[PDB]
Write a protein that binds this ligand. Structure first.
Ligand SMILES: Cc1cc2nc3c(=O)[nH]c(=O)nc-3n(C[C@H](O)[C@H](O)[C@H](O)COP(=O)(O)OP(=O)(O)OC[C@H]3O[C@@H](n4cnc5c(N)ncnc54)[C@H](O)[C@@H]3O)c2cc1C
Ligand SMILES: Cc1cc2nc3c(=O)[nH]c(=O)nc-3n(C[C@H](O)[C@H](O)[C@H](O)COP(=O)(O)OP(=O)(O)OC[C@H]3O[C@@H](n4cnc5c(N)ncnc54)[C@H](O)[C@@H]3O)c2cc1C
Lengths: 267, 284
């Protein structure tokens, strides 16, 4: 396999979503992802739920599972205790984040590397983090995280492919040598995606807004239309040298599974 | 540079909204189950206000009763121009004229003139229909050349012959190699055929069945397509997404080339064709 993939899941908050997640884990695990990750939500499950899912994935599939760890409302001593626990129990890859609120993500990267030789992934923003002083400052921050020890950068989702491409070029110009892995968000629920995008400054091309117009009560068409968009995107990215994709599955597997299939990533 | 072109294609497609005509082809159901499925599809697709819809007729089946009834049932249920397919198999000239005149006197003014897969040619059928009355006549076109045809050129002159006889528009056999259809369209105008070569689109959800249809109609399945469906025999969900993707990409390219008319072989299913139409701006 020339292309590597990873899948992102979130801690289920209901019995129904819990069932869906494990079904998705089994489906996607067959594609042998390089790793999978589980997000964290301070008021939507906490660290224990994130850790529980991580442990469950590891026990059930043997896959490398990376918890997303944030450093807000958490003290350095707490983070070191947590990191040590994770390492001693087989968790060797962490997605180091600041989280939405003193410490910035680069501070956490440093703290983690002091504890152990963790594989570390950090967030990158092709369209600039909402709170950044400027695009230049945000790029310098990414370089700071990479220089602190980050092994790879995973981007916020995007729908304007050129935005990702230009960003990758600026990263290279800035001397950031790790892979800038595009985070792909397959869209089946446009209203939810639009809310996500508006809150993260991610641009939704006019042709895309037009493409989902009128489908609020048509889930089947939304899925076909969304899969087409995602398949076209990864095709172009692949043609531009991208060999790694991180999928925001939202705990569902059909779309990401099919997209991987078109990339030659099969069981 | 690859990214820019994509955004351009997608935007031009978004701007086509409200300028593309579409037609849907259906076949007579053989079970109570397919009967319900058909009418559910008709109700759903009718909301897209197609230029017209058509119903196939099994050549040498004698079930011409089912086809005609469905046609009337569609016209009386939706009010859409329902065009029945007519063949030259198991029918005499005097017999055909009877059907033609029977249709015209029942509201049916559009007919798809076909010879029919053998168990008197289409051109002879159009000429015959023309004299009986002034129906709109749609004939079959083959981008990859009809199996029986002795040559590509001979097959082409035949279509012209059918057009010259009074055929309004030609509808192509489904195809998956866009470049083949484009080369054929160029040959059609270069050969003096003045009607549009309407692409017949076959959205694929069942590759096995499609591969079969292709081996019976002499339609080529590109290597990239076989590769795209490889390993999905027991994955209907993935096949549908992959098939919808291929179909959406095809019409997007065709639309940019100037095609404003599409004919969908629905196989009595609405989901895929409905979605493909959506991307073309054809919506309720
Ligand atoms: C792949 C990915 C996964 C994510 N997973 C989660 C998750 O599970 N849970 C969750 O809560 N959030 C998650 N997030 C969201 C993330 O936590 C927010 O975007 C958060 O606001 C910033 O986190 P960060 O790690 O990018 O922080 P940082 O890299 O620290 O950046 C945050 C802001 O601070 C700025 N900055 C950095 N250093 C300085 C400085 N010295 N002075 C001033 N400004 C500075 C940056 O330019 C930027 O504007 C994820 C994001 C991505 C792209
Ligand atoms: C849109 C579409 C809808 C269809 N619907 C149906 C349907 O409802 N029912 C059904 O039974 N079938 C249907 N068919 C299939 C069709 O009937 C078969 O392909 C059949 O073989 C006859 O094709 P035709 O109408 O193109 O006949 P023709 O146009 O007569 O051509 C058929 C062959 O005869 C050759 N030819 C023509 N005239 C001569 C001549 N004078 N000398 C030598 N060679 C000649 C041509 O080159 C060609 O190979 C459909 C096909 C399409 C593309």
């Amino acid at each position: 396999g020339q292309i590597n993939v990873s899948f992102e899941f979130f801690p289920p908050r209901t019995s129904e979503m819990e069932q869906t997640l494990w079904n998705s884990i089994d489906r996607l695990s067959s594609l042998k992802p390089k790793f999978v990750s589980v997000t964290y939500g301070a008021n939507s499950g906490e660290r224990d739920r994130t850790h529980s899912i991580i442990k469950g994935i590891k026990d059930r599939t043997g896959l490398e599972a990376a918890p997303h760890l944030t450093c807000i409302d958490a003290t350095p001593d707490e983070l070191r205790t947590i990191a040590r626990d994770y390492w001693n129990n087989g968790i060797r890859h962490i997605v180091a984040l600041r989280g939405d609120l003193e410490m910035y993500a680069s501070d956490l990267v440093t703290l983690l590397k002091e504890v152990a030789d963790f594989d570390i992934s950090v967030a990158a923003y092709p369209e600039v983090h909402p709170e950044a002083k400027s695009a230049q400052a945000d790029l310098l921050n990414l370089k700071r995280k990479v220089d602190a020890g980050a092994n790879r950068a995973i981007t916020q989702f995007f729908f304007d492919v050129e935005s990702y491409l230009r960003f990758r070029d600026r990263c290279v110009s800035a001397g950031i040598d790790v892979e800038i892995i595009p985070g792909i968000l397959p869209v089946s629920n446009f209203k939810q995606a639009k809310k996500f995008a508006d809150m993260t400054n991610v641009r939704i091309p006019a042709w895309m807004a037009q493409m989902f117009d009128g489908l609020d009560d048509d889930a089947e068409t939304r899925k076909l239309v969304g899969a087409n968009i995602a398949m076209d995107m990864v095709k172009i990215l692949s043609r531009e040298g991208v060999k790694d994709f991180h999928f925001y599955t939202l705990n569902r597997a059909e779309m990401s599974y099919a997209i991987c299939h078109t990339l030659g990533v099969r069981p």
